[model samples]
Target: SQQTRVLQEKLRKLKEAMLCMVCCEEEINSTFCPCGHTVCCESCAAQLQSCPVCRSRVEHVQHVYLPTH
Candidate 1:
């Protein structure tokens, strides 16, 4: 399912995404695991053969995000 607008809005205030992690663009939206590394979002994570941050295989996973610091 697509992420809700409320979720997107909340994500925007976080320290900006630095790389595409998928398309190599500058706009990223979410993070990927196996290394707790950030990514663009599910859109990019789904296309990966490997992690851009760790250079490891993109292990499929399900995760939850909380406002934890």
Candidate 2:
């Protein structure tokens, strides 16, 4: 039981960390754009011109992964 509990705890932490990781020296906590650019944090994506990948210049990047929903 103890081993199982420890495994579960480790898994939980891993999942949480995976959902939010550092990118471009910034901490991104599960928030992706609609244009397939998944490196923008909640604040930085606001004034971004393009998807930072294709460089097509998006008007407003949609929030795919919000913290609450």
Candidate 3:
């Protein structure tokens, strides 16, 4: 079905955009910095206290579980 294919493409693009730029494999959902910049995965984000791009202090991370729409 065309709608199914379109949804699949949307999911593919979403996953591509969710990939961590630093690790290149993990999903970048729950690990964005206070500066709204995401570069690493959850584990890596836990290890970082500041954003490498903006130098903003990272105090917390919110875990967002996205649902299929």
Candidate 4:
């Protein structure tokens, strides 16, 4: 049970880290512009033209899906 608890804690931290600060809706899936700021999902990123953090111009959006257990 200890090992399971440890794994669960790790997963919890990972989920917390995955939350997008931009829209705070979906998990982070793409970088914000060329600034390389890691935040926002494709749907949310699709609505923006610039990075929410540094305000860099968003040239394009690249999708990055996280593996689910």
Candidate 5:
């Protein structure tokens, strides 16, 4: 039971990390170029021209797939 609780806690944190920082609602699926950061969803990425976390110029936005297992 203790091990099961630990696993559940870790899973919760992992899911939280996958959320977009901008909206805090959508899953992050966009990757900013040059800076190479993935911190926002596709909708938020399209509206910005700079990386939200590093403040670097966003040269390109790439949609990436994250494997869920």
Candidate 6:
């Protein structure tokens, strides 16, 4: 039961980490360049002109692939 609780907690953390900070619904798949911040999905990234985390100028939005294990 203790191990099950720990696993559930870990899963929750992982879900939060993978979710987009901007939309809070989509999985993060895009990274803002110059600032190098990755916290939003491609759709959200397209709508943003600056990095939400650091408030830095976004010169490029690069799509990245995250490994699913």
**lDDT, each prediction:** 0.60, 0.57, 0.72, 0.79, 0.91, 0.90
**Model 2 lDDT on a 0 to 1 scale:** 0.57
Compared to the true structure, candidate 2 yields what TM-score?
Answer: 0.42
Q: Candidate 6: lDDT over CA atoms?
A: 0.90
Off by over 4 Å in 4: 1-14, 66-69
- Candidate 1: list runs displaced more than 4 Å: 1-15, 18-31
lDDT of 6 by residue, 4-38 (tens): 99999999998899999988998999999988998
Lowest-scoring 10 consecutive residues by lDDT in candidate 6? Answer: 60-69
Q: Candidate 1 on 1-69: residue-level lDDT in tens?
A: 366876786686454444455676545555566666676566677677777767877566344353542
lDDT of 3 by residue, 1-69 (tens): 999999999999877777776677887766554577765678777777778678789978766565621
Candidate 3 TM-score over all chains jointly: 0.58
Q: TM-score for each prediction?
A: 0.45, 0.42, 0.58, 0.65, 0.83, 0.88
Give me the candidate number with maximum lDDT: 5
Q: Pick the candidate with the highest TM-score.
A: 6
- The runs of at least 3 residues in candidate 2 whose Cα sits more than 4 Å from the true structure, single-residue gaps closed, are 1-26, 29-34, 66-69
The alpha-carbon lDDT assigned to residue 8 of candidate 5 equals 100
- Model 5 segments beyond 4 Å from truth? 1-4
Ranking by TM-score: 6, 5, 4, 3, 1, 2
Itemize residue pairs with steric clashes in candidate 3.
Answer: none
Q: Model 4, 13-69: lDDT tens per residue?
A: 878778777667678888765688877877788888878888889998877766851
Q: Higher lDDT: candidate 2 or 3?
A: 3
lDDT of 5 by residue, 1-69 (tens): 999999999999999899998998999999999899998999999999989899999998999998951
Backbone Cα, N, C clashes tallied per candidate: 2, 0, 0, 0, 0, 0
| Number of backbone clashes in candidate 3 | 0
- Residue 31, candidate 2: Cα error in Å is 6.7
